[PDB]
């Protein structure tokens, strides 16, 4: 009966990812970053996610992860901005950078 196993959208409960899918990018699953509007984000990297909607075409501008292009990842249900999808890199080719405090962690 684990209580930490899955991540849901904090705003609506949409199923998004699992603890098992945490990815230590550059040796840490957590990355503390800011965007050009100076917003600070505690980003958890996941190899896999579901229930998102990826919007727009990938951009390399201001990428926090060298060699990766990002798209905005919204909650596919409620439209909450949950993070970004990263692609175009190597090892891994793709992953998700999700904003920790926008997810709720709990049992399956």
């Amino acid at each position: 009966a684990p209580g930490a196993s899955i991540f849901r959208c904090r705003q609506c409960g949409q199923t998004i990812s699992r603890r098992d899918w945490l990815l230590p990018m550059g040796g840490d699953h957590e990355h503390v970053v800011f965007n050009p509007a100076g917003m600070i984000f505690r980003v958890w990297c996941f190899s896999l996610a579901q229930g998102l909607r990826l919007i727009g075409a990938p951009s390399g501008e201001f990428s926090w992860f060298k060699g990766y292009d990002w798209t905005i990842a919204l909650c596919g249900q409620c439209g909450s901005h949950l993070g970004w999808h990263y692609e175009g890199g190597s090892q891994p080719q793709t992953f998700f950078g999700l904003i920790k405090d926008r997810l709720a962690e709990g049992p399956a």
């Binding site: 970053v33 509007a37 926090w64 990002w70 950078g97």
Partner: peptide, 4 residues
């Protein structure tokens, strides 16, 4: 807003 939502830029990475």
């Amino acid at each position: 807003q939502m830029q990475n």
